[PDB]
Each structure stands twice: as structure tokens, then as C-alpha cells.
Amino acid sequence: RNCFESVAALRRCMYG
């Protein structure tokens, strides 16, 4: 949900 919480979350979110 909060994509910009970790590098992992950010990556998976921006990928899809």
C-alpha cells in the first residue's frame, strides 16, 4: 500500500 516504506516495497510496487 505505502510503496515508499522500503526499497523492496518501492521496487515491487513500481514494477507492478
Side-chain angles (χ1 to χ4, degrees):
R1 330 74 39 230
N2 304 102
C3 298
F4 301 97
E5 69 192 330
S6 64
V7 298
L10 195 173
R11 280 174 63 195
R12 300 311 308 178
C13 176
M14 77 181 189
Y15 303 159

